[PDB]
Ligand binder design. Structure first.
Ligand SMILES: O=C(O)[C@H]1O[C@@H](O[C@H]2[C@H](O)[C@H](O)[C@H](O[C@H]3[C@H](O)[C@H](O)[C@@H](O)O[C@@H]3C(=O)O)O[C@@H]2C(=O)O)[C@@H](O)[C@@H](O)[C@@H]1O
Ligand SMILES: O=C(O)[C@H]1O[C@@H](O[C@H]2[C@H](O)[C@H](O)[C@H](O[C@H]3[C@H](O)[C@H](O)[C@H](O)O[C@@H]3C(=O)O)O[C@H]2C(=O)O)[C@@H](O)[C@@H](O)[C@@H]1O
Length: 231
């Protein structure tokens, strides 16, 4: 039988601050249900250690969505509220099966758009350089569809071992740290000033697969939203 993620202590803080969306943005499990041992092939404890997400289908997901702690409702914060908003993770991204082309593993999202997606990418060219099997950031600086609405950055080549990430937002600027090294340093998020519906997400969100049957799979060794005010 599949072991529940809540069976160990490692993820209890974030599970107390998240709902699970699967296989779409529809609710799969409340925070209380997650802490109560919710489990399925889409969300289970692997190796007694990893919170593992799995999902197949274009634009489908198995993802945690940041909630107000202790049974609260959906959270919404703003890039310019003066507080530092921080998400941390340690992720083992396995080799992805054929047909999986891009898997979003962490986000900043709002009511209407993704401010940031950190994603594994099979193959893509950025600023004239071709990259394969790597982790990328995509930041929106507008809601348009043209390339000038995005800043896309190679963060790191995918590693077999765990890779640490940290996302920080403060005073309308974004920093991303990968394995302890700042890779994105103060990217401007001021386009989003005044949007008070932002929140963190993490898990697996499957983007533009070439087979809707192909199952994306992502293993978290650690995940947290870090509260700088210590509530
Ligand atoms: O490689 C490129 O830069 C090409 O990307 C195209 O634009 C992307 C855009 O960068 C971004 O990745 C976007 O991401 C969406 C995602 O796939 C999901 O649909 C959902 O999360 O919503 C995201 C979003 O709307 O921001 O997808 C688009 C895309 O068109 O596929 C083009 O800009 C292309 O010209 C460019 O070469
Ligand atoms: O297009 C998407 O799939 C986007 O969905 C987003 O989640 C939303 C979405 O509306 C979802 O159905 C659900 O909405 C709930 C939620 O409780 C909301 O606060 C409202 O009060 O009731 C809705 C309901 O009863 O269905 O969750 C929403 C949310 O913001 O959490 C995100 O998953 C996006 O990432 C996604 O692009």
């Amino acid at each position: 039988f599949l072991t529940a993620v809540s069976s160990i202590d490692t993820f209890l803080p974030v599970l107390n601050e998240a709902k699970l969306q699967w296989p779409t943005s529809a609710l799969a499990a409340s925070s209380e249900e997650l802490l109560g041992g919710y489990v399925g092939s889409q969300f289970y404890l692997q190796d007694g250690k990893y919170m593992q997400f799995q999902i197949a289908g274009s634009s489908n997901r198995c993802e945690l969505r940041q909630m107000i702690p202790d049974g609260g409702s959906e959270i919404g914060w703003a890039v310019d509220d003066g507080t530092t908003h921080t998400a941390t993770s340690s992720i083992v991204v396995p080799e992805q099966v054929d047909g999986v082309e891009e898997v979003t593993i962490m986000q900043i999202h709002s009511g209407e758009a993704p401010q940031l997606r950190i994603s594994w990418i099979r193959s893509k060219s950025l600023d004239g350089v071709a990259y394969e099997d790597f982790i990328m950031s995509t930041v929106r600086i507008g809601t348009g569809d043209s390339s000038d609405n995005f800043v896309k950055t190679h963060l790191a080549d995918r590693t077999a071992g765990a890779m640490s990430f940290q996302i920080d937002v403060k005073d309308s600027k974004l920093t991303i740290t990968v394995n302890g090294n700042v890779v994105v340093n103060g990217q401007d998020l001021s386009f989003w000033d005044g949007t008070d519906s932002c929140y963190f997400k993490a898990g697996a969100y499957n983007n533009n697969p070439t087979s809707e049957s192909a199952t994306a799979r992502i293993k978290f060794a650690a995940l947290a939203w870090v509260d700088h005010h210590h509530h």
